[model samples]
Target chain A: FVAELNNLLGREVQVVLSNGEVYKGVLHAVDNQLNIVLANASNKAGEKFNRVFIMYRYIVHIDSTERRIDMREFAKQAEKIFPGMVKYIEETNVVLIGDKVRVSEIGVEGVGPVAERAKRLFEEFL
Target chain B: FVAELNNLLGREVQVVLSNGEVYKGVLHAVDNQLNIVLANASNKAGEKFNRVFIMYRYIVHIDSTERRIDMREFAKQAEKIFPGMVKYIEETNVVLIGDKVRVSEIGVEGVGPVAERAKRLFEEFLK
Candidate 1:
């Protein structure tokens, strides 16, 4: 369950609280306590929030309607371009390319010529 | 928070779920994941359940209306009576008497003469 939740990070998901309030947002972070941080969140009433923190005590359920992108599949594509430079961390559900460009379900992160190309590849893949 | 919750074991607590349902029961067991097991449970409507397992995903809030009992104080009492035969496990919030009797917030547990005396002491303490 931990790994499954970790994979969901950086993806669009909806969180329902104990009060029946729902928030739609991109999952930014989650901890062992089930505490969650969301980016670009919107409440049921269409109220927008840049960032939101949901406490574990109030969370009822969290789900995603967006299609899941398999990181392994993305890693395969990255390997074709970078060869042995692609490294996939199964535990964290993340991929590293050229030890500079880091990729996850959300998008590519880093800065440099390598990162620039990695981001372009990610954009085309999306 | 994990230790605080673990210390609640063997006590009466009220659990409120995501759906606003409430269950009152004795906390039997709890884990790092916050999954909880309850004994002698009853719902808001007073329906009875012998034992209940509550999933971590559904739990919203857990609280207790009952007064908290200090196990350390109880251990002191037991030690005075038994003269060095009492041992208190702080992490688990439990007391041991004469290496034969175990006591927690709920009550005393064990068998034989030492257990009987421990139970008697517990009863007296309650009275």
Candidate 2:
């Protein structure tokens, strides 16, 4: 099953961190230890492109829903709750931290709707 | 409201990385840049307790759901999706990713059901 799941290249999955935050991206690779690698999986603009390492143990939930979310939706929701939090919206997968941290995709699951959504969201910022 | 959300120390929240990955833990701190600090939030055992830094820009979605998930449920689902994918199940919040990177709590939004879920998950690993 690991191999089969690994075969799910270019597919979209919802990454829920321990902080109750959700990131939608594609699964690119998985190692023997079940550590997942992601790529092109940024939710905002101006995010750095470094490999994001997600230990299989740290993951709380993985939503493989077919419905993809857009940046407008994300901004609408994030700004509604966080307020003045939406920094940049670009065509690339970018994470908007203060001024230090930059998020980029190194490995991910698939490259389907989620990737499309991410691309679209980033485009808005450009 | 930022201060109120920051006040959610020791509470659990979900952190999803750019790779479509998810983690649950407590919101320890947030800096001027909206960077999050998490703690005591591991999903499995043998996880490193180093600080996790999350830039506010990379965040996609934040779920404030009241329902907290348990490790048993997580393991069950994870194993179902990717069998043998669950490395460890501990009360502390841990992420098992290869041998190089170790995940710990750095920053998050609010604490509640999600934080509880993260703590319960990491405790099973006992790292």
Candidate 3:
């Protein structure tokens, strides 16, 4: 699955660091070892860097909120054993990893609010 | 707004278990209700779990950084009430939600720099 995700060469993602810092930038490349390279990324006002490399294992969350998925296909495959389990189907292509959620689409007004709410909900779980 | 957000597919988000955890593989599909199909998702280190639903309310933050807002056709809409308020709007295709602040973008070069600066800042916030 990750290999498939890494196929998105020029996509962008929002990454949250261990100390709760967040970053939004383009995913320049990813190697077979799962090391991710991000470019042209910018963080809060004062936080900026040219490039960042994140190890796959250390990554907590990768929000794949904007990818395309065929929920119909997913449901069709699940119809046999778990008939009713797939009752309500809503699909958003965003992938949420441990602490990071990578998003491809950019410039949506309410994006910040959604990410914040998700983080809070998850934190409460902890 | 949240209700409207919840309306969009009722999607589940991946949360980092404070001790460091990861979740992924599928959004929501092919899981068993009674048969108890354990949906296998991956985590960072030693963490693991099953179909656990989360709430919407206390969400300290919400990440929207998606949804295509037409920057081209809407060029004329740039006339803002807060004209100067419109800064370098790098539309994320997503938004970052956070605790006291929405998203902290600054980088702490090293532990020494961060710790010394953070300690001083904490003292300032205290004062």
Candidate 4:
């Protein structure tokens, strides 16, 4: 197990559990028990998470990333100016770049840059 | 499962067997059985394998890439002129860039650009 994880060191990884909960991060380590360590970890929602470890048994599925450039550009650029309420999201690769603002499918909550960007993102799509 | 498979098609993936074996390549397809198909398929050895099919039941784990810029700078640069013995490797992200050459931890086997590059990668690292 350690050796297999050694293969993934320093790369991105996703961990899916039988309950359907999921995680994304860089593979950090693995143990003989089949446990795993992930660095710079986060949820599909794009919210940052602390380092985590998972027992191999709970995993039902997993995969890597690659995502959207649209809603992201706004979410990021706008985030800087406003403090929006970016909720936990659903997709794995939601393009959670940056910004003090975070836009969610539920809609943007804060005012200023975050809201403006959300509006732009939604307007562009519509 | 279908939905899950849908996300992976074009990206690279690694399948780690509970038995300790591993497979690296691009995710081409997957099914309800957890079966997977990897494209531009190649082993850790780097010899290039066909689109592989794996059942989920045997899976111990899975992961992605990002590797040694040094070794790869050579393998890719060298693979072009020489078809050395860049065997299957142990690492997931082999830095398998260009030049037609692939290098494994085993050592550089091909000649020409591939070998020369491998030598440089090693030399630079040693220096």
Candidate 5:
């Protein structure tokens, strides 16, 4: 669910730590290993932290009250620009445009001339 | 929670794929992408596959009806063997023995003499 988590960005979430501490906050960023950054976070005991960076291993469970940016929907959107080149690879959860550019919920994963165009289209999609 | 999934080894699990396919089976193995190997798996349509390898990105959710291997407890167990050398790095969810050996629910991640010893201790813990 690594790629799937990018959908949870800008949403409120509940996080259960390995120590059984509960945190509720708005997700700001998440990395590959699942290290998380949250804004306006508060713990189960009502202890508040304005922004928190949580290590991946310390996080036991993560749930959100909300949603998935439809990759298929986004693929079709990109297809309008790239035509036959746009392909969504299910096994990797990324839209491949030509041979180089890859797009996911986080947008263009690489940077180049075509990637820049893909990124622009992605930002426009948002 | 990548390391945490090791606790589910040998257990039944429900896997939801990105295409909205549901799979139920005994989890045989899982890798970094959450790519799973399920034994005796059947899909929502009741089509049976003796073994199924679902790639990680295709997997949207994975849950076990039944579990963490208690990494802290296992750390203490390793400390018994290595004395002061063993340390549990909570940020990464791994046990460090001296500088050479690393142990997790998956057991010793590397090779050599110290790692062999660590691996032995881990296997004993499972027994």
Candidate 6:
């Protein structure tokens, strides 16, 4: 549901329009014809076009505003659980370490050890 | 349907694995776990491993083989139909130009002059 995507509201995001222009801003609203409003909009190189309805279809990609995460602490935690597992990530809701994503398992709703262990871990760190 | 997406199988595509590595190859197959096989797969900068089974969920984007699409001739068409219409694109099936995309009209199946005209235009062009 496009409505579900609204959960991104109030979060910072970078919307890349088809022109290859990138606008960084907090999502405000999404309307039909796929109109999306972003605040403090800036270009890809981070600069243009008046704080502007990103028209439909022009949107190439959009994701949560990136914020710094503690790489070192999580690295330790990733190893603790998966052992040889080289990395850990929080899924939109978690995976393997490739041959670039290769080990690990799924954390379905309250089931796997992956979930149980990470419980106290995320609480301690995040 | 992802099955519909299979129509792209024979075309060249670049599959960007989430590891930030890009795989450029032609589609071979897409299996149950969302596994995709790409023939002669290479890395983003053009080099990589023995060509592997791109695990599922790693795909961020997959699009047509980047065989050159003519921009100039088409720009002329968008202009001819919607004079000031600075751009035109084919929807899965069609819209206005805003505040960034402001002009244009819909072309629904079996209806509208936009469709009737495009039928003539596309056949005239593609064929």
lDDT of 2 at A114: 45
Q: Write the per-residue lDDT of candidate 2 for residues B27-127, one digit (tens) a residue.
A: 77866545677776553444645566677666543333233333343444334433444443255553332232222443122255544444454454322
Error of 3 at B57 (Å): 27
Q: List the residue pairs that clash in candidate 5.
A: none
lDDT: which is higher, 5 or 6?
A: 5
lDDT of each: 0.79, 0.48, 0.38, 0.55, 0.75, 0.52
Q: All models, DockQ values?
A: 0.06, 0.03, 0.02, 0.04, 0.02, 0.02
Using TM-score, rank the candidates from best to worst: 5, 1, 6, 3, 4, 2
lDDT of 2 at B122: 43
Give me the displacement of residue A125 in model 1, in angstroms. 21
- Report the CA-based lDDT of candidate 4 relative to the real structure: 0.55
lDDT of 3 by residue, B101-124 (tens): 111123112244434543343333
lDDT of 1 by residue, B1-127 (tens): 5666666788899988878768788886677888776667777877665455565889888998766676777887898888879999965789988776899988999999888888888877775
- Interface RMSD, all models, one decimal each? 11.3, 13.0, 11.3, 8.9, 12.6, 12.2
Prediction 6 TM-score vs. true: 0.32
Q: Pick the candidate with the highest lDDT.
A: 1
Q: lDDT per residue, candidate 4, B7-73, as tens digits?
A: 4467666666655566778878877545677777766666677767777666644554423234443
- Could you tell which candidate, 2 or 5, scores higher by DockQ? 2
Per residue, candidate 5 scores C-alpha lDDT tens digits across A1-126 of: 455456678878766565667688998898876788999999978999999899876665465434346576678788888888899898877899989888988889777888888988888776
Rate residue B48 of model 6 by lDDT.
Answer: 58
Regions more than 4 Å wrong, model 2:
A43-50, A67-126, B1-127
**Per-residue C-alpha lDDT of model 6 across residues B1-127, encoded as one tens digit per residue:** 1432364566666654556776867778876444688887888576755556787655643444233233333445545665664354545212332123322332223455655655565444432
Q: Which stretches of candidate 4 lie over 4 Å from their true place?
A: A1-126, B65-127
TM-score of each: 0.34, 0.25, 0.31, 0.29, 0.36, 0.32
lDDT, candidate 6, residue A115?
A: 56
